[PDB]
Amino acid sequence: LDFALSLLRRNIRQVQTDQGHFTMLGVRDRLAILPRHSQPGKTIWVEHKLINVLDAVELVDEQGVNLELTLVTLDTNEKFRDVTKFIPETITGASDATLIINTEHMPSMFVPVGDVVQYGFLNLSGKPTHRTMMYNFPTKAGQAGGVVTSVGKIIGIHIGGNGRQGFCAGLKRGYFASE
């Protein structure tokens, strides 16, 4: 739990948008990631501070299909320690993953989702979505944005669920290539 513990403290923040409470992973410097349906926009609340969003990029694939990820550049002096090195180069499943959740309503919470498998296509609330992975755990509302970790790796971001299963958007280190 050392990794998940250090990642929560250094990198994972309680967040609010117009869509409600979400978990947010700071990736490096002022770059952070959120589930697309959180619709950050121009501003978000990070730990009850109203922050300006300088940039928001919604990840889609070459065909323009939703990946349910939104990269945000925050207007803050605070820098996140670089965790891109814990993000695998290709979207990979895992064994015994821990879903890390951190919102005002569900603070500092570890969820034993278990195995994480390649899933692919998912119709998330009527929206076609690609590159998703799945875990057989009854995830619930308010857990979106949750960080899926396994053996020192950050493999996904929780985005949805169907009652008995949880889904995350796969994480590639390539998403975070510098400019």
């Binding site: 589930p35 349906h37 296509f121 998912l122 119709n123 998330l124 609330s125 995830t139 619930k140 509302a141 308010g142 857990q143 979106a144 929780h158 985005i159 949805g160 669920g161 169907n162 299963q165 949880g166 889904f167």
Partner: peptide, 8 residues
């Protein structure tokens, strides 16, 4: 009715 889920 497969491959379905809702945002959470």
């Amino acid at each position: 009715g497969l491959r379905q889920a809702v945002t959470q």
